[PDB]
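Hey all, quick one. A colleague (J.T.) asked me to put the A1BGY job into the tracker so the inputs and the structure tokens live in one place instead of scattered across chat threads. No bug as far as I know, just bookkeeping. Sequence used:
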Amino acid sequence: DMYIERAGDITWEKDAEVTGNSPRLDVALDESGDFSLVE
Amino acid sequence: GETTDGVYRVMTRRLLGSTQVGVGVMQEGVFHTMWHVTKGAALRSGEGRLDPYWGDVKQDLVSYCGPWKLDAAWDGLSEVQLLAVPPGERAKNIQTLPGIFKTKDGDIGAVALDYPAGTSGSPILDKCGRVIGLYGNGVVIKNGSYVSAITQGKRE
Ligand SMILES: Cc1cnccc1NC(=O)c1cc(C2CC2)n(C)c1C
């Protein structure tokens, strides 16, 4: 039985850790809402 | 229940201790999460009850107390921030330039940051702090890593 707790304001924070890449991927979305890689 | 705008953890006690199953966004009195977090189940906010209002397993989205409110879009150019809320750990902004999911029905923003599955539903933000969609539905890549769509609903 699920419950929620507040974890912060939703704010852009200048000088946050910058990381991650920007990959262009070919994908398919099925009726169950699962993404898959098309190759 | 707490109806203050912001980001919230979604917790269960149906397992060992208190387990974080995901995250969501409260905005204009509506709670927004991913379908795979709640499976459409009702939620508690203290002694208050949140009932599902709208849901779609294909979008992997669900809203509580009212219709989907979040309509901001990734501009296709600018960096974004994942406001990650990991299990046991404080809210943290991570800034990133999204990649792109190419599908038969159009292109979608994608973010390549590893976090546990319990982070699913964390909001992705634009430079004005608007929620452009949620993190937690995507694909596993050659590396073994995870890439999440920027999943956004429709406002009516
Ligand atoms: C459980 C589920 C059901 N249906 C669709 C998507 C999911 N999501 C995952 O499987 C998932 C999400 C993440 C992290 C980015 C948050 N990780 C690492 C995994 C494996």
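Adding what we noticed when we looked at it: The two ends of chain B are 26 Å apart (CA to CA). Residues 6-64 of chain B form a domain with the Thrombin, subunit H fold (CATH 2.40.10.120).
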